[PDB]
Design a protein around this ligand. Sequence first.
Ligand code: HEM
Length: 152
Amino acid sequence: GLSDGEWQQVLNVWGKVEADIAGHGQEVLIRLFTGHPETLEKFDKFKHLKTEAEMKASEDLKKHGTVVLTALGGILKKKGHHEAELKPLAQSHATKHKIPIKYLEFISDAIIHVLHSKHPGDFGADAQGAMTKALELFRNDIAAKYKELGFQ
Ligand code: HEM
């Protein structure tokens, strides 16, 4: 898993996100959609977004950004003891949303991208390392639930 020192770095980095959760949330989603357009097709409520301007101008996209990061934040604060929080998410994403684990990889990298973009020179090597481990743990535990369900 992660060491205590690493969890501290992770939650320290999260303080940045918490200062503007909707902003970070919005940019993470836009980065995901613009970098991987197929991901947009998984959202029946965002498919109408034809341009990045429309994306940036969407209040509902900002709203979902808050929903997504708030959920991730609650999970990170469990520092690994997130079975109860993670299971239901893995199941709705595999069964209801049909989100391949590949997309969870995309969003993880998108989070790292947004942190550097919004905080250049203030997201150190040790910080990127700890946050990456956390996102991998999150991703890996979801992958386990996916195998359980036989979802691809
Ligand atoms: C950091 C990773 C992610 C977190 C924490 C997260 C969290 C959430 C939460 C809490 C909801 C609402 C409740 C639910 O339906 O379970 C949701 C809905 C949804 N998510 Fe995720 N999500 C993540 C990644 C993804 C990715 C990578 C995609 C697709 C590219 C995706 C697609 C969707 C869709 C389609 C919905 C339903 C939207 C709607 O119709 O309202 N999610 N997500």
